[PDB]
Amino acid sequence: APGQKECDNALRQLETVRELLENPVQPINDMSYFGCLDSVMENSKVLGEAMTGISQNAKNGNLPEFGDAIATASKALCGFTEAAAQAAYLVGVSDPNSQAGQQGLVEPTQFARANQAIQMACQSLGEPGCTQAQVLSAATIVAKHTSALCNSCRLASARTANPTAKRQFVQSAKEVANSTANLVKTIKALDGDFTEENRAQCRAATAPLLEAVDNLSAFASNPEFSSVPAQISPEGRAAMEPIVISAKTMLESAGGLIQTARALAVNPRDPPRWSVLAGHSRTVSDSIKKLITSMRDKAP
Amino acid sequence: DIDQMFSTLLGELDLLLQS
């Protein structure tokens, strides 16, 4: 039983990271091509060490060290996939017939979620049968998302060369940050105070924040700030393909490695599974070698 | 602590207030 949850979590993490290879036609991080090559090289070293840790600790029944090696492999495999997916995008967009497009100022999905979370927290802290503890827990949700919104505003301000947009992203973030401080002040103010006037008073302090959040959502929704997707030409997709296939093969074999290790950890008396394990481990290594060679040969 | 907690949550908020 012990060790199996680590393996199950790793297999779930692999299933998630594999979506990055389905249509890698947009950037997924800020890594340069050499950033990608550096990350692939470092993770190759880490994974090599982890694959040896997985086999040796399953063999010897060191189940805490086995679990750490499974977790370490998983993290290195996810890093590899992120680097491979970014590298593929950069290869595709570098083709002469590709159109690179532009980065949007604010990632829209997490932006909308942050605004909704603040709005829902403000509504929750205002519900009539809500306990004082729920007021405080709602405040922590507001603080979390207020910090994320401010960071994203500072980034958006950095990304734009338009002085008016530069200034407005900061001012809008400032309005959100100061309204949260006033709301937190009023929550902190509540001490042994659980009366209808303070319930109404907390509700009252949500208004400037909800308005500031709405004003920022309206400002940030200007189509001028939106991403314009890259267009990858057929030849760019052909150029990316060896990187994508090698990364997909690494993950397929890594998944088999982890499934095999999960069984061997419980029962290491299994000569067939030991060969399968060595086969998956060598195919993982072969795929990484092919991916690095492909990243160098197909380099823009 | 009630102040330490909200400080941990508010992240790098000061970079905006000072700005």
Side-chain angles (χ1 to χ4, degrees), chain A residues 1-4 6-44 46-58 60-98 100-153 155-166 168-296 298-300, chain B residues 2-12 14-16 18-19:
Chain A
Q4 291 190 152
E6 291 90 339
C7 287
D8 287 350
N9 286 312
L11 286 161
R12 277 195 293 272
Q13 286 154 12
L14 296 181
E15 289 293 277
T16 296
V17 85
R18 163 80 175 77
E19 302 309 317
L20 301 175
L21 303 170
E22 284 293 307
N23 190 39
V25 292
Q26 304 301 328
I28 55 156
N29 54 58
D30 297 336
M31 286 187 73
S32 71
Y33 196 77
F34 316 95
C36 295
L37 254 176
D38 288 345
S39 185
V40 159
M41 293 313 292
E42 167 56 332
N43 281 295
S44 172
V46 175
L47 183 57
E49 292 163 359
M51 288 189 297
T52 300
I54 289 158
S55 63
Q56 289 286 299
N57 291 303
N60 294 332
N62 316 121
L63 295 203
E65 292 93 337
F66 169 83
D68 289 341
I70 292 291
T72 299
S74 181
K75 189 193 179 190
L77 293 156
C78 293
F80 253 114
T81 305
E82 295 172 342
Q86 179 75 0
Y89 158 70
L90 290 169
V91 166
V93 80
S94 74
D95 184 69
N97 285 12
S98 291
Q102 212 93 51
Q103 191 74 319
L105 298 185
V106 180
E107 196 283 297
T109 286
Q110 194 55 41
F111 185 73
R113 284 229 189 125
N115 295 335
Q116 284 172 52
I118 292 163
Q119 285 156 355
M120 292 177 347
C122 283
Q123 195 56 17
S124 285
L125 81 87
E127 287 264 329
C130 94
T131 71
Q132 188 160 108
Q134 286 178 289
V135 173
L136 183 50
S137 62
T140 71
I141 296 169
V142 173
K144 177 189 142 43
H145 293 283
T146 286
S147 164
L149 285 181
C150 288
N151 276 354
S152 69
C153 283
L155 181 59
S157 179
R159 280 173 173 172
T160 183
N162 173 349
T164 302
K166 269 195 138 50
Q168 188 58 57
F169 270 105
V170 169
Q171 183 58 53
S172 299
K174 204 176 281 178
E175 293 171 359
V176 170
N178 293 331
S179 298
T180 54
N182 164 260
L183 177 61
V184 171
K185 204 181 127 292
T186 286
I187 289 169
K188 287 192 350 196
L190 301 170
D191 277 71
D193 211 49
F194 319 92
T195 62
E196 205 74 317
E197 172 213 88
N198 89 74
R199 295 171 102 101
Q201 159 150 45
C202 287
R203 280 194 247 202
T206 66
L209 177 54
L210 294 166
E211 285 162 44
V213 166
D214 191 52
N215 290 340
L216 170 59
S217 177
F219 169 71
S221 85
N222 195 317
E224 193 184 306
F225 307 153
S226 56
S227 267
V228 298
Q231 298 187 76
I232 311 302
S233 70
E235 214 277 293
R237 288 183 172 277
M240 307 160 35
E241 186 100 71
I243 291 159
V244 175
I245 294 168
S246 288
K248 286 174 173 188
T249 306
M250 168 198 80
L251 291 175
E252 183 68 36
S253 292
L257 191 165
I258 292 159
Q259 292 175 330
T260 305
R262 188 195 185 267
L264 286 165
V266 198
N267 178 28
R269 296 276 174 134
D270 195 341
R273 275 194 177 82
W274 287 112
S275 284
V276 169
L277 190 74
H280 286 129
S281 164
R282 182 50 108 77
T283 306
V284 168
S285 297
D286 285 350
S287 301
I288 288 165
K289 295 182 47 195
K290 288 171 185 232
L291 184 178
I292 290 163
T293 58
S294 301
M295 283 188 64
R296 287 156 157 279
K298 303 225 91 182
Chain B
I2 183 165
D3 280 359
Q4 165 274 325
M5 180 180 69
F6 276 101
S7 171
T8 296
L9 296 175
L10 290 169
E12 307 293 297
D14 289 359
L15 293 173
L16 272 182
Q18 90 154 346
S19 168

